[PDB]
Amino acid sequence: VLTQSASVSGSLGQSVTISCTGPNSVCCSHKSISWYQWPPGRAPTLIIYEDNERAPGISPRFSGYKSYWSAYLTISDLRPEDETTYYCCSYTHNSGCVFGTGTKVSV
Amino acid sequence: VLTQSASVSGSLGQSVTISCTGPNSVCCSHKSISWYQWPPGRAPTLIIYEDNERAPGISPRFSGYKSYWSAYLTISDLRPEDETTYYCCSYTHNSGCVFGTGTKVSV
Amino acid sequence: VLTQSASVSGSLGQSVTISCTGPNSVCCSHKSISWYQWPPGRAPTLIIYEDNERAPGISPRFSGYKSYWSAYLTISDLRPEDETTYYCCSYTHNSGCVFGTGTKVSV
Amino acid sequence: FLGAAGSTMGAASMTLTVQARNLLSGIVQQQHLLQDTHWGIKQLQARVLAVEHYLKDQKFLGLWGCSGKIICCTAVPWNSTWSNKSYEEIWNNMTWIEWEREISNYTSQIYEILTESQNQQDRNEKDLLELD
Amino acid sequence: FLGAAGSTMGAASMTLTVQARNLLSGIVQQQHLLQDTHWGIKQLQARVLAVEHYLKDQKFLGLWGCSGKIICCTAVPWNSTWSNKSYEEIWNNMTWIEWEREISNYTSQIYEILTESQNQQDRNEKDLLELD
Amino acid sequence: FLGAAGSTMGAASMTLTVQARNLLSGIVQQQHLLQDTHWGIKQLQARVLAVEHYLKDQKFLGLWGCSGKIICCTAVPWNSTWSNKSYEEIWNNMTWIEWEREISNYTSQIYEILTESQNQQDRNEKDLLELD
Ligand SMILES: *[C@@H]1O[C@H](CO)[C@@H](O[C@@H]2O[C@H](CO)[C@@H](O)[C@H](O)[C@H]2NC(C)=O)[C@H](O)[C@H]1NC(C)=O
Ligand SMILES: *[C@@H]1O[C@H](CO)[C@@H](O[C@@H]2O[C@H](CO)[C@@H](O)[C@H](O)[C@H]2NC(C)=O)[C@H](O)[C@H]1NC(C)=O
Ligand SMILES: *[C@@H]1O[C@H](CO)[C@@H](O[C@@H]2O[C@H](CO)[C@@H](O)[C@H](O)[C@H]2NC(C)=O)[C@H](O)[C@H]1NC(C)=O
Ligand SMILES: *[C@@H]1O[C@H](CO)[C@@H](O)[C@H](O)[C@H]1NC(C)=O
Ligand SMILES: *[C@@H]1O[C@H](CO)[C@@H](O)[C@H](O)[C@H]1NC(C)=O
Ligand SMILES: *[C@@H]1O[C@H](CO)[C@@H](O)[C@H](O)[C@H]1NC(C)=O
Structure with a gap:
């Protein structure tokens, strides 16, 4: 029910942005949005847990934001290790996690 | 020389007021006015010593006030034990006490 | 190079003033001016070291001031012990002392 | 300790100082041992x-x-x-x-109340205040 | 000491008071010798x-x-x-x-830094401030 | 105690901190008994x-x-x-x-004066002030 950009591409040292939006009951107002780097066939990684807050050890070149109808994940200073699928989730303190449709960052 | 209301009457749960006034040299400006409940033929009782200040243990339904020409003693929530004679006095920190003409609260 | 008033006179209980002025590089802006009582043929005495500040033990009747082109030494409540020659000097924290041409206070 | 405790509390409020002086130690002239x-x-x-x-x-x-x-x-x-x-x-x-x-x-x-109240007010509220 | 140290620091921030009480001495009922x-x-x-x-x-x-x-x-x-x-x-x-x-x-x-900084700010700067 | 007392008072005003550090106790590395x-x-x-x-x-x-x-x-x-x-x-x-x-x-x-003055000002006057 959470939709993202189908696919997206970038180049060296750039900044690729991915969207995450849905209905009012899924992605609107102040429901926390998390972003995971999730390479296909391996283990995920917490990139950004709270809307504007990252995970420890994450390179500072990853940023997150949330509008009133869509959340955005930005990857700056693109490096070859970023070429994976990324997924978002909507959650509150007790409500369960609702993942997204994913987005493959090309280069 | 200190004059009060001759006599006064009330009923259950009411509030009867008694006056205490005299010349400028007796009851005017800021000379402290005290009010004693004084049943006839028995021992008195300090009801209100300073103009707006009561004695310890007194029921809070007794109040006092002082204008620029007369002091007033109010008895609220009248009860049968209030049916006595009340007297006022004018005094300072070193000047002697000058009692009043008394007032019998009927009911 | 530092010039003063040639000579000056006063009387009992008065206040005689002496000037000390020179070029911009000698007596101008904020170069400290000191005043010494220096009887001829004997030892000097520090009267005023900083422009508005005296030496310890000096009678308070001695005062100093500095304008933007001349410094002034005032002696109030004149007494016979003041009848000496007075000299001024221009100095900074590291620059050397440059004395003046002196002034004999008559009476 | 110079203050007289037979006086009213409003009178000893003025004498608090000498009593607080004697509390710490005696007036000077510490003990050879x-x-x-x-x-x-x-x-x-x-x-x-x-x-x-x-x-x-x-x-x-x-x-x-x-x-x-x-x-x-x-x-x-x-x-x-x-x-x-x-x-x-x-x-x-x-x-x-x-x-x-x-x-x-x-x-x-x-x-206990005095310690809890005076501490909460001067720590939690002042902390939240300078937080913004 | 009543506070439980197994709770997060944000939880023990509330319990600081009982621990600070027990630090000074035990609760009253000091020791006959x-x-x-x-x-x-x-x-x-x-x-x-x-x-x-x-x-x-x-x-x-x-x-x-x-x-x-x-x-x-x-x-x-x-x-x-x-x-x-x-x-x-x-x-x-x-x-x-x-x-x-x-x-x-x-x-x-x-x-050491905390003692130097908090002291300099509250002494030298405040001294120079009331100087004028 | 690191500060040198041969310097002027305006110079030791800066060094007050190390002397106040050494006063409490020695620097860590308390004594086995x-x-x-x-x-x-x-x-x-x-x-x-x-x-x-x-x-x-x-x-x-x-x-x-x-x-x-x-x-x-x-x-x-x-x-x-x-x-x-x-x-x-x-x-x-x-x-x-x-x-x-x-x-x-x-x-x-x-x-004695310093204790009386600084106490009166910060207690009696401040008490009368918050009284109104
Ligand atoms: C909670 O904080 C602790 C910090 O102590 C994190 O655990 C540390 O992990 C590193 C290695 O990643 C160890 O070297 C430390 O000894 C650990 N400290 C401990 C266990 O007290 C822990 O990862 C944090 N939790 C999360 C979810 O990030
Ligand atoms: C002054 O205050 C004392 C309060 O201690 C009053 O005396 C107390 O009276 C009660 C009974 O009325 C006793 O139980 C207390 O032990 C008394 N305390 C003492 C004597 O210290 C006293 O009545 C007050 N004075 C006036 C004039 O009201
Ligand atoms: C610096 O201050 C000291 C104050 O102590 C001055 O020396 C004092 O001089 C008097 C006599 O003039 C003696 O009785 C004191 O014992 C001295 N105190 C000392 C030596 O500590 C000294 O004169 C001042 N310096 C200048 C240049 O004025
Ligand atoms: C103070 O009075 C309130 C009023 O009911 C009461 O709840 C409280 O327990 C009292 N506390 C103490 C220490 O007397
Ligand atoms: C704190 O970080 C700064 C940044 O370079 C460093 O110069 C300083 O030595 C550090 N101090 C401590 C106590 O870690
Ligand atoms: C301070 O000087 C005043 C001025 O006369 C004097 O009355 C007072 O006793 C002096 N106090 C001390 C402690 O020197």
Whole structure:
């Protein structure tokens, strides 16, 4: 029910942005949005847990934001290790996690 | 020389007021006015010593006030034990006490 | 190079003033001016070291001031012990002392 | 200790200073100690007890934000259950020992509330305040 | 000491008060001393060590301008070298003993900087300020 | 104690901090005690005297409203009888031991006045102020 950009591409040292939006009951107002780097066939990684807050050890070149109808994940200073699928989730303190449709960052 | 209301009457749960006034040299400006409940033929009782200040243990339904020409003693929530004679006095920190003409609260 | 008033006179209980002025590089802006009582043929005495500040033990009747082109030494409540020659000097924290041409206070 | 406790509390409020002076130690002219074997240990115990009681009172003071003041006003409202006596009944009719005797049974809860209230106000609220 | 150290630091921030109460001395009902010869000297040493540790912590507090507060905010910025952990990582994921273990190696330099900074600001700058 | 007392008072005003650090106790690396019978009592006396002098100075500080500061300004005017020396004569020509030697005979009255004045101002006047 959470939709993202189908696919997206970038180049060296750039900044690729991915969207995450849905209905009012899924992605609107102040429901926390998390972003995971999730390479296909391996283990995920917490990139950004709270809307504007990252995970420890994450390179500072990853940023997150949330509008009133869509959340955005930005990857700056693109490096070859970023070429994976990324997924978002909507959650509150007790409500369960609702993942997204994913987005493959090309280069 | 200190004059009060001759006599006064009330009923259950009411509030009867008694006056205490005299010349400028007796009851005017800021000379402290005290009010004693004084049943006839028995021992008195300090009801209100300073103009707006009561004695310890007194029921809070007794109040006092002082204008620029007369002091007033109010008895609220009248009860049968209030049916006595009340007297006022004018005094300072070193000047002697000058009692009043008394007032019998009927009911 | 530092010039003063040639000579000056006063009387009992008065206040005689002496000037000390020179070029911009000698007596101008904020170069400290000191005043010494220096009887001829004997030892000097520090009267005023900083422009508005005296030496310890000096009678308070001695005062100093500095304008933007001349410094002034005032002696109030004149007494016979003041009848000496007075000299001024221009100095900074590291620059050397440059004395003046002196002034004999008559009476 | 020079102050007379037979005076009203409003009178000893002025004399607080000499009593607070004598509390710390005696006025100067500290004690030469020859260190008698098996003796003087009572003297060391006496000095330790002196500093212990001083520190107890300073602990109460510092927990109350009054670590530098002799008189400090607190934001603890007075419980009428502690005493229904008025201001002119306390400060003009009672003496300090009398009032402390009357308040002794509640003094413990007073200390606990006073420590909790004065600390919360000056720490949590002031912390949240400078947070913005 | 009533507080449980298994809770997060944001949880023990509320319980600070009971722990600060138990630090000074035990709750009242101090100890009758018959003064056994060659005995009880360990008890005097115990009391002296108690007041010594209390005074050490109060020395650190008073040098920091916090002599009257339990929580005080300081003008010392946090060094990322001490810990790169965030606010929600410290106050929501760590417990007080864990955090003190992580910070133990830098605690000394933290104390020294905190004493120098908080003292300079509240003495030299405030002195120069009232100078004019 | 690192500070050199041969420097002027204006120079040791900067070095106050290290001297205040060494006063409390030595820098860390407290003392293992095997408790020799009839021995070590001199060591307990030494520790008690250390805490006693520290507490004497902190008593003077706390009575003066300066319980949290190293430098505090007071509302006590300077008596010219104590010393007619100027500011640049004191802070630029004298050293701390010299100045304390000069002021030693008046130090007692200075302490008493300083305790009375700083206490009255911060207690009675502030009490009457919040009264309205
Ligand atoms: C002054 O205050 C004291 C309060 O202690 C009052 O005396 C108390 O009276 C009650 C009974 O009325 C006794 O139980 C207390 O032990 C008394 N306390 C004492 C004697 O310290 C006293 O009545 C007050 N004075 C006036 C004029 O009201
Ligand atoms: C909570 O904080 C602790 C910090 O202590 C994190 O655990 C540390 O992990 C590192 C290695 O990643 C170890 O070297 C430390 O010894 C650990 N400290 C402990 C266990 O106290 C822990 O990862 C944090 N939790 C989360 C979810 O990030
Ligand atoms: C610096 O200050 C000291 C004050 O102590 C001055 O020396 C004092 O001089 C008087 C006599 O003039 C002696 O009684 C004191 O014992 C001296 N105090 C000392 C030596 O510590 C000294 O004169 C001042 N310096 C200047 C240049 O004025
Ligand atoms: C103070 O009075 C309130 C009023 O009911 C009461 O709840 C509280 O327990 C009292 N506290 C003390 C310490 O007396
Ligand atoms: C804090 O970080 C700065 C930044 O370079 C460094 O110079 C300083 O030495 C550090 N101090 C401590 C106590 O870690
Ligand atoms: C301070 O000087 C005044 C001025 O006469 C004097 O009355 C007072 O006793 C002096 N006090 C001290 C402590 O020197």
